[PDB]
């Protein structure tokens, strides 16, 4: 509810790192 | 060869995942010692920028061995499809899991955790490293209740005290305004992220709770108002870390920065030198239950099949294997 692991806005990202 | 390999380990359990890696609980067979194992797929390593972050993560991991509140490295090795970091296992679970179970922490507990995180960050900064991914999931609790930061893949290394960089990166909830505005930035973005995390611990929710375009807009525009039940000193420290101007934000002045943190009224009861020696007893003691303390890890991970995902041979056979030459490492201090 309050905190969702990997939920909206909670995923790490980078313009210089390939994801997925 | 001195180096260890995958066949030197027993795979016990999956304990975590993020955007870039899978993390397993492992046993080093010859010593019967337990470690965590971070696994990165080589197919994700496309360009030089991907090689950069892997090499940076390894190097910060190496330096981490010198500080009590950073996760240290035992060994590194690779297979055809993957890169492996064997690192110390911290079995109290992470602060994301802690917050889900506790809902909200007393000011004393947040003070303790934030002071230990502050010392970890300062150690990195002193050494020219911006951390760049502080979040609840990346702060681990050890058996005794002290913390350790993990996950060094977002780090920028090699910055002299006044230097800046400009990569758009981080976790959206925690990303500083100067990044979102496209400015060159320094160590300031870590202090902002700590402000967010502290608000999370003491209020039980993100201060920016609410498409990511909208979240970015909120971060850039909202002025945070502190819940009235928090003390003046707790309110003061949150507002100062969450200053949208990096030149005025607590901890960010190039001369007085870390001193300003140490001397803030919120941190008055902290003996910083004793703390950095783990001579302050933590306010909470983790319960180590289930095999290896695995009850402190989300069951969505610990219920996963204990496996490395089968390779696509067609993809693997095209991988340039020379770009990871000399990746093999063993920590000579055991
Ligand atoms: N040394 C460790 N001990 C215990 N749990 C760990 C350890 N390292 C990572 N984890 C857990 O695994 C999760 C994902 O690991 P992480 O290194 O952050 O991968 P990533 O986000 O893809 N980069 C973390 O959020 C922790 O819950
Ligand atoms: K360490
Ligand atoms: Mg890239
Ligand atoms: Mg992570």
Author numbering:
A (entry chain B): 1 to 20
B (entry chain A): 246 to 455, 466 to 589
Copy text verbatim from the article accompanying this structure deposition:
Atypical protein kinase C (aPKC) is a key apical-basal polarity determinant and Par complex component. The atypical protein kinase C (aPKC in Drosophila or PKCι/PKCζ isozymes in mammals), its binding partner Par6, and the small guanosine triphosphatase Cdc42 are three essential determinants of apical membrane identity in both Drosophila and mammals (Fletcher et al., 2012, Harris and Tepass, 2008, Hutterer et al., 2004, Izumi et al., 1998, Joberty et al., 2000, Lin et al., 2000, Wodarz et al., 2000). aPKC isoforms PKCι and PKCζ have regulatory regions distinct from those of other PKC isozymes, but share a conserved catalytic protein kinase domain. Like many protein kinases, activation of aPKC requires activation-loop phosphorylation and an αC-helix conformation compatible with Lys-Glu salt-bridge formation to bind ATP and serve to align residues within the R spine (Kornev et al., 2008).
